Scaffold this motif. Structure first.
Motif, PDB file in Angstrom:
ATOM      1  N   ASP A  50      40.230  45.625  41.214  1.00 35.08           N
ATOM      2  CA  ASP A  50      38.869  46.339  41.534  1.00 35.08           C
ATOM      3  C   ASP A  50      38.473  46.613  42.463  1.00 35.08           C
ATOM      4  O   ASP A  50      39.459  46.671  43.725  1.00 35.08           O
ATOM      5  N   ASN A  55      32.946  54.322  46.079  1.00 30.91           N
ATOM      6  CA  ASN A  55      33.512  53.511  44.767  1.00 30.91           C
ATOM      7  C   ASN A  55      34.741  54.064  44.554  1.00 30.91           C
ATOM      8  O   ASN A  55      35.648  53.354  44.277  1.00 30.91           O
ATOM      9  N   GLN A  56      34.787  55.405  44.401  1.00 25.28           N
ATOM     10  CA  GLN A  56      36.143  55.961  43.741  1.00 25.28           C
ATOM     11  C   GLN A  56      37.027  55.636  44.664  1.00 25.28           C
ATOM     12  O   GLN A  56      38.320  55.405  44.199  1.00 25.28           O
ATOM     13  N   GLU A 115      38.438  51.861  44.226  1.00 24.68           N
ATOM     14  CA  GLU A 115      39.114  51.759  42.776  1.00 24.68           C
ATOM     15  C   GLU A 115      40.761  52.017  42.834  1.00 24.68           C
ATOM     16  O   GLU A 115      41.479  51.707  42.056  1.00 24.68           O
ATOM     17  N   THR A 130      42.076  47.753  35.050  1.00 28.60           N
ATOM     18  CA  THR A 130      41.045  48.149  35.792  1.00 28.60           C
ATOM     19  C   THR A 130      39.995  48.556  34.949  1.00 28.60           C
ATOM     20  O   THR A 130      39.831  48.564  33.449  1.00 28.60           O
ATOM     21  N   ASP A 131      38.637  48.739  35.476  1.00 27.93           N
ATOM     22  CA  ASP A 131      37.421  48.917  35.009  1.00 27.93           C
ATOM     23  C   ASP A 131      36.873  50.349  35.704  1.00 27.93           C
ATOM     24  O   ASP A 131      35.969  50.947  35.145  1.00 27.93           O
ATOM     25  N   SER A 132      37.891  51.156  35.872  1.00 25.43           N
ATOM     26  CA  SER A 132      37.635  52.783  36.416  1.00 25.43           C
ATOM     27  C   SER A 132      38.146  53.518  35.460  1.00 25.43           C
ATOM     28  O   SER A 132      39.490  53.909  35.413  1.00 25.43           O
ATOM     29  N   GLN A 133      37.342  54.142  34.646  1.00 20.83           N
ATOM     30  CA  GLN A 133      37.643  55.171  33.953  1.00 20.83           C
ATOM     31  C   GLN A 133      38.343  56.518  34.918  1.00 20.83           C
ATOM     32  O   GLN A 133      39.269  57.046  34.325  1.00 20.83           O
ATOM     33  N   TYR A 134      37.365  56.740  35.949  1.00 25.29           N
ATOM     34  CA  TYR A 134      38.003  57.437  36.993  1.00 25.29           C
ATOM     35  C   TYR A 134      39.475  57.326  37.242  1.00 25.29           C
ATOM     36  O   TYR A 134      40.310  58.459  36.887  1.00 25.29           O
ATOM     37  N   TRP A 181      42.106  49.301  30.341  1.00 23.18           N
ATOM     38  CA  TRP A 181      40.945  49.660  30.888  1.00 23.18           C
ATOM     39  C   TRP A 181      40.032  48.736  30.180  1.00 23.18           C
ATOM     40  O   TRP A 181      40.106  48.327  28.709  1.00 23.18           O
ATOM     41  N   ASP A 226      35.759  40.871  40.699  1.00 28.08           N
ATOM     42  CA  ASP A 226      34.556  41.591  40.753  1.00 28.08           C
ATOM     43  C   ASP A 226      33.703  40.981  41.985  1.00 28.08           C
ATOM     44  O   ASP A 226      33.293  41.612  42.866  1.00 28.08           O
TER      45      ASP A 226
END
Ligand SMILES: N#Cc1cc(Cl)cc(Oc2cc(Cl)cc(OCC(=O)Nc3ccc(S(N)(=O)=O)cc3Cl)c2)c1
Lengths: 559, 404
Positions: A445, A476-477, A480, A499-503, A537, A551
Motif C-alpha cells: 500500500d 498517491n500514485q 502505490e 495491491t488496492d491500486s487499479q492504477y 487487486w 493501510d
C-alpha cells in the motif's frame, strides 16, 4: 497578352451578414502612383482589369514596391478585408503526390500554365467587390478606379476556382484518352504515357492545342523542361527518384536554429535513406533557450549525427511504382522506441523508406509499438498506392498470437510474415494466472498527504515481515508504485503481490517494457529478474486481511 | 413540391474530412456515382460549395455488388431539430415484445422524392483519388439521401400510405421506420411470419422499394455471474468481494461483511478456507438480486445512450448500455477466419440494432481499440446502412473480469 478562357464562371458569394470591403486608400508617393498607372493601363489593355466610376462603393488598398535588384515595379493589393468577407471554398487539394506513388511511364512531360490566374475569368457580380483605387498626388483629384475581371493574386478563391476551371477543361480530353495520366498540381500538369516518343509528342501537342482552345497557354517543346525535374524538394529522373542534395553544416557551435534545420533535413532525408536517426538530436531541443543560442552536443548526439553522415555519403535513389505487383513492407527495430521501414516491390529495390518513433502514451512495450508502426504504414500505403502492403516483421507468429489473444484491446495486422532480423520483438516477462503456492504474499500500500505532499510506502507479508519507507514529494500514485517496487526488492524469485491500486495494476498488467517514469523502469527490471510473479487487486477500506494492516501502517502520520 | 429544411440556428453545414479509400472502393464509387448522375440523383458541383461529408464503399450480408454508404453523422447532428422534434417518428414500445422482427431495406424509396434546392449544398461529398493525382470528384444530392435522418422524416407521410392497406389487414403487426430500414414484428409462427413479410414486399414493390430475422422476446439478461465451488481460496474470496464490491453501486442491497470477515490477519492466497454458514447467506441473497433487473433505472428520452464493450478473449465480448454510468439499461454478450476488428464490428452492429428495437435511437460506443486501426479497418466488415457514433477507450483491468 495572355488570353482569358471562354469557360463558364463560378458564382462566388460573400459571407452571410457581410458586405464587401470599404477600406481607405493610403496616400502614395508620385513614383508609386506613376508606376501603378503604367501597370494598370497595361492590364486594362489585356482585359485583366476595367475602369469604373466612384458610384461603386467598395475599395481595397493598393501598393507598389520596386525590387531587390532590377528596376521593374510590382503592384500589390492588400486583399485582407475582401478575403475575410468571401465565402469559404472547398479545400483545394488534400495531400500532394508522393514520388513513390508515381506509376512508371514510358514518357512524361511537364506543362506549366503561363499566367494561370489571369487566364481565367471571375464571376461578374463579384468583380465589383474587387474595386481598388490609384490615388492622385495628395488629395485633390478623385483616384483612378478599377475592378478585376480575372482571378486576382492573393484573393481567397483563386486557387480553388482555377483548379475547378482546369478540371472542367480537362474532362473531355481525358475521355477520349483514358490511358494518359495527367497529374494536376497547382498550375502544372504532368503528363505520362507508355508510347514511343513519336505519338507522345503528338498527343501532348493535341493536349496543348485542346488547352489553348480554352485560353490556356503552355510552353512548346524546347521551352518545356528536361528531366531531372527538381520538384517540391525531390529529384525526378526517368527511372528513379530521390530528395535533392542534403548537405549537413559543419560548425563549432550549434544554435537551436541550427539543430531545428538539421532535424528537418534529416527527417526529409528519411523517406529514402534508411537507418536515419533523430532522437539524440531532438532531445537537445526539449526546454531550449534562444533560437540564436548555442547548444553543446551531447556525446550520444555526436554519435547520432556521425552515423547519419555515413549514410549520406554516397547517394541513394528510389524506384517508381508498378501496379501489377504487390507491395512489401519490412520493419526493423532500431532501438530507443525507434523503428525503421522500407517499401519495395522487387527485393531490395525500394520505392521509399521511413522511420517511426512516436511514444504512444506513457508506458508501452515493443509489440504495441511494432503494431502502431504497422498501422502508420498501412495508412500511408492507402494514400499513396491505394492498397495495403504485405508485411514482413521481426516478431515470431507465436509471440504475436499470445499477446493479441491475452490483451484487453482489440488488434489486427494485415497479412504478415516473420523475418529473422535481430533484435527480434519479444515480451520480457509474463505474470501468473494463479497464485504461487509456497511463495510469500506481500500486501502493498501507499499513501500521501495532499498538502505536505509527503507519503509513506510499505508492505506487510504473510510471514510476519513488514516495512515502511517515507517519501518527500509524492502523490498517491507514486506511493502505490513505490510500494510495489519495495515488495519486489525484498521478495526474491517468486512473490505473490496484492495491491488496492487499479492504477499500478493497469500499468503492470500491460507488460510495459519502457516508461517515461524511472520508477516504472525500476519495476520493470525487478519483474524481468523474477521467475514467477503473481499480482492481484482488492478494494481498499474494507478491512481485508493483509490490506487493512498495511493501510494503517502507511497511514500513520499521513492520514 | 419540396418540404423546406432548416439548419439548427447559427450553426451550419458539415465540413468533414474524407478518408483515404483503396483503389477498388474508389472505382466502385465512380461506377455507382456516374450511374446516379445519369439518373439525376446527384450532380457535380463547384468550388463554391465548401461542405463535405465522408463516403465509403461497403458490401452487405451476402452480395458482390458494392454499396455506397455516406457518413451523415455530422449532418444529422446539425439537423437534429428538423428530423427529431419537428418531423419526429414515434417509436412504438410494442416493437420489442414481438416474437420475431424482420428488418427490410427501404432506402431505395428516397430516390423518388426531390430535396429542397436550398439544402442540396449541405450534402456534398468527394470521391478521392490515389496519390492525389487529380482533385476529388465532388457531388451533391438532388434527392433524399440514404443515411440522412431527414429523409425518412420527410418521407414519413408517403410511407404511411404505402402501409395503410397492410396495417388495416394485420392490426397486430408493428412496423417502425428507422433511417433506411423498416422493422416488422409479429407474434406469428415463423412460417406465417416469413409469409407476411413476403406479402409486405409486394406492397413495397408496387411503389418502387425492393431478409433480416430477430427475436426480441428471447433477448434475456447477462447476470453478473459469481462462481459455485468446493474449497474456496483466499484469492477466490478476494476476487469474490472484488466482483461483489463493484456489483453494489448499481445493484441495491449487495452486502459483503460476512464474506469479508472470512479473511482476517495477513495470510497466503492459496490457503484454503472453510465457508461459515453466515457467509453463504450472502452468496445466495446476492445470487438472486444478481439475476434480476436493476430497479431505479428508466430510459430517459432526452438523454444520449452509451454502450461500453469489453474483449473477453476466445471470441467473446460483453457489453452494457446505460445513460447514467452504472445505471444499466441492458447487458449482454456476443460470441463468434474471424479477427478482432471483424468481431468488434459484428458486435457494434448487433448492439446498435437491439438498441434500435428497444429505444428507437442508437448508442455512442466506447470502443476498446486504437482509433487508427478501427478507422482503417471498420468498413471491411461493416454492413449496416447507418453508422453509430463512437469514441476510443482503454478498457479498465477489472471491468473485464467483473462482467466475465
Ligand atoms: N507529383 C509529381 C510530378 C511532378 C513533376 Cl515535376 C513531374 C511529374 O511527372 C511524372 C508523371 C508520371 Cl505519370 C510519372 C512520373 O515519374 C515516374 C516516371 O516514370 N518518370 C519518367 C519517365 C520518363 C521520363 S522521360 N524519358 O520522358 O524524361 C521522365 C520521367 Cl520523370 C513523373 C510528376
Amino acid at each position: 497578352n495572355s488570353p482569358i478562357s471562354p469557360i463558364e464562371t463560378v458564382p462566388v458569394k460573400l459571407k452571410p451578414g457581410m458586405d464587401g470591403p470599404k477600406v481607405k486608400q493610403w496616400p502614395l508617393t508620385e513614383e508609386k502612383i506613376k508606376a501603378l498607372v503604367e501597370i494598370c493601363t497595361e492590364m486594362e489593355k489585356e482585359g485583366k482589369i476595367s475602369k469604373i466610376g466612384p458610384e461603386n462603393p467598395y475599395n481595397t488598398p493598393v501598393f507598389a514596391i520596386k525590387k531587390k535588384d532590377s528596376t521593374k515595379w510590382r503592384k500589390l493589393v492588400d486583399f485582407r478585408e475582401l478575403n475575410k468577407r468571401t465565402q469559404d471554398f472547398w479545400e483545394v487539394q488534400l495531400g500532394i503526390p508522393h514520388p513513390a506513388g508515381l506509376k512508371k511511364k514510358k514518357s512524361v512531360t511537364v506543362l506549366d500554365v503561363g499566367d494561370a490566374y489571369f487566364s481565367v475569368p471571375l464571376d461578374e457580380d463579384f468583380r465589383k467587390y474587387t474595386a481598388f483605387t490609384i490615388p492622385s498626388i495628395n488629395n485633390e483629384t478623385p483616384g483612378i478606379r478599377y475592378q478585376y475581371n480575372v482571378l486576382p493574386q492573393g484573393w481567397k478563391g483563386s486557387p480553388a476556382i482555377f483548379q475547378s476551371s482546369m478540371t472542367k477543361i480537362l474532362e473531355p480530353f481525358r475521355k477520349q484518352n483514358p490511358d494518359i495520366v495527367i497529374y494536376q498540381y497547382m498550375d502544372d500538369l504532368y503528363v505520362g504515357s507508355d508510347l514511343e516518343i513519336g505519338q507522345h509528342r503528338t498527343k501532348i501537342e493535341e493536349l496543348r492545342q485542346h488547352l489553348l482552345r480554352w485560353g490556356l497557354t503552355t510552353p512548346d517543346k524546347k521551352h518545356q523542361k528536361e528531366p531531372p525535374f527538381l520538384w517540391m524538394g525531390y529529384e525526378l529522373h526517368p527511372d528513379k527518384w530521390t530528395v535533392q542534395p542534403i548537405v549537413l553544416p559543419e560548425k563549432d557551435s550549434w544554435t537551436v536554429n541550427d539543430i531545428q534545420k538539421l532535424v528537418g533535413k534529416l527527417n526529409w532525408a528519411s523517406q529514402i535513406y534508411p537507418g536515419i536517426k533523430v532522437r539524440q538530436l531532438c532531445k537537445l531541443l526539449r526546454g531550449t533557450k534562444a533560437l540564436t543560442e548555442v547548444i553543446p552536443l551531447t556525446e550520444e548526439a555526436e554519435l547520432e549525427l556521425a552515423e547519419n553522415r555515413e549514410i549520406l555519403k554516397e547517394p541513394v535513389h528510389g524506384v517508381y511504382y508498378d501496379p501489377s505487383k504487390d507491395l512489401i513492407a519490412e520493419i526493423q527495430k532500431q532501438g530507443q522506441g525507434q523503428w525503421t521501414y522500407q517499401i519495395y516491390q522487387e527485393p531490395f529495390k525500394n520505392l521509399k523508406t521511413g522511420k517511426y518513433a512516436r511514444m504512444r502514451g506513457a508506458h508501452t512495450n515493443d509489440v504495441k509499438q511494432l503494431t502502431e508502426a504497422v498501422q502508420k504504414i498501412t495508412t500511408e500505403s492507402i494514400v499513396i498506392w491505394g492498397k495495403t502492403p504485405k508485411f514482413k516483421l521481426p516478431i515470431q507468429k507465436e509471440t504475436w498470437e499470445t499477446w493479441w489473444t491475452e490483451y484487453w484491446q482489440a488488434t489486427w495486422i494485415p497479412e504478415w510474415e516473420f523475418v529473422n532480423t535481430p533484435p527480434l520483438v519479444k515480451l520480457w516477462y509474463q505474470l501468473e494466472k494463479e497464485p504461487i503456492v509456497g511463495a510469500e504474499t506481500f500486501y502493498v500500500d501507499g499513501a500521501a498527504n495532499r498538502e505536505t505532499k509527503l507519503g509513506k510506502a510499505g508492505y506487510v507479508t504473510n510471514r510476519g515481515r513488514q516495512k515502511v519507507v517515507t517519501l518527500t514529494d509524492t502523490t498517491n500514485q507514486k506511493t502505490e508504485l513505490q510500494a510495489i517496487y519495495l515488495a519486489l526488492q525484498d521478495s526474491g524469485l517468486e512473490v505473490n503481490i496484492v495491491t488496492d491500486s487499479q492504477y499500478a495494476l493497469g500499468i503492470i498488467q500491460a507488460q510495459p517494457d519502457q516508461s517515461e517514469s524511472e520508477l516504472v523502469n525500476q519495476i520493470i527490471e525487478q519483474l524481468i529478474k523474477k521467475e514467477k510473479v503473481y499480482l492481484a487487486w482488492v478494494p481498499a477500506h474494507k478491512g481485508i486481511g493483509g490490506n487493512e494492516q498495511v493501510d494503517k501502517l502507511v497511514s500513520a502520520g499521513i492520514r | 413540391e419540396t418540404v423546406p429544411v432548416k439548419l439548427k440556428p447559427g450553426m451550419d453545414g458539415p465540413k468533414v474530412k474524407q478518408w483515404p479509400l483503396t483503389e477498388e472502393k474508389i472505382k466502385a464509387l465512380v461506377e455507382i456515382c456516374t450511374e446516379m448522375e445519369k439518373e439525376g440523383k446527384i450532380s457535380k458541383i463547384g468550388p463554391e460549395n465548401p461542405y463535405n461529408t465522408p463516403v465509403f464503399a461497403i458490401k452487405k450480408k451476402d452480395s458482390t455488388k458494392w454499396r455506397k454508404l455516406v457518413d451523415f453523422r455530422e449532418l444529422n447532428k446539425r439537423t437534429q431539430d428538423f428530423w427529431e422534434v419537428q418531423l419526429g417518428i414515434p417509436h412504438p414500445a410494442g416493437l420489442k415484445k414481438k416474437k420475431s422482427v424482420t428488418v427490410l431495406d427501404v432506402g431505395d424509396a428516397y430516390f423518388s422524392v426531390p430535396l429542397d434546392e436550398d439544402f442540396r449544398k449541405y450534402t456534398a461529398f468527394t470521391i478521392p483519388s490515389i496519390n492525389n493525382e487529380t482533385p476529388g470528384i465532388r457531388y451533391q444530392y438532388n434527392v433524399l439521401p440514404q443515411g440522412w435522418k431527414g429523409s425518412p422524416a420527410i418521407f414519413q407521410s408517403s410511407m404511411t400510405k404505402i402501409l395503410e392497406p397492410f396495417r388495416k389487414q394485420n392490426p397486430d403487426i408493428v412496423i417502425y421506420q428507422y433511417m433506411d430500414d423498416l422493422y416488422v414484428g409479429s407474434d406469428l409462427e415463423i412460417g406465417q411470419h416469413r409469409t407476411k413479410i413476403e406479402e409486405l414486399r409486394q406492397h413495397l414493390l408496387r411503389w418502387g422499394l425492393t431478409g433480416y430475422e430477430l427475436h426480441p422476446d428471447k433477448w434475456t439478461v447477462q447476470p453478473i455471474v459469481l462462481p459455485e465451488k468446493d474449497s474456496w481460496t483466499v484469492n477466490d474470496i478476494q476476487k469474490l468481494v472484488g466482483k461483489l464490491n463493484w456489483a453494489s453501486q448499481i445493484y441495491p442491497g449487495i452486502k459483503v461483511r460476512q464474506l469479508c470477515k472470512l479473511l482476517r490477519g495477513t495470510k497466503a492466497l492459496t490457503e484454503v478456507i472453510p465457508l461459515t454458514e453466515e457467509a453463504e447467506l450472502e452468496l445466495a441473497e446476492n445470487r438472486e438480486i444478481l439475476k434480476e433487473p436493476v430497479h431505479g433505472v428508466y430510459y430517459d428520452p432526452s438523454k444520449d445512450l452509451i454502450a461500453e464493450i469489453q474483449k473477453q478473449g476466445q471470441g467473446q465480448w460483453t457489453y452494457q448500455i446505460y445513460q447514467e454510468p452504472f445505471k444499466n439499461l441492458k447487458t449482454g454478450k456476443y460470441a463468434r477466419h474471424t479477427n478482432d476488428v471483424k468481431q468488434l464490428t459484428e458486435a457494434v452492429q448487433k448492439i446498435t440494432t437491439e438498441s434500435i428495437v428497444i429505444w428507437g435511437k442508437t448508442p455512442k460506443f466506447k470502443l476498446p481499440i486504437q482509433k487508427e486501426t478501427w478507422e482503417t479497418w471498420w468498413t471491411e466488415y461493416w454492413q449496416a446502412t447507418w453508422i453509430p457514433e463512437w469514441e476510443f477507450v482503454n478498457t479498465p483491468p477489472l471491468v473485464k473480469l467483473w462482467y466475465q
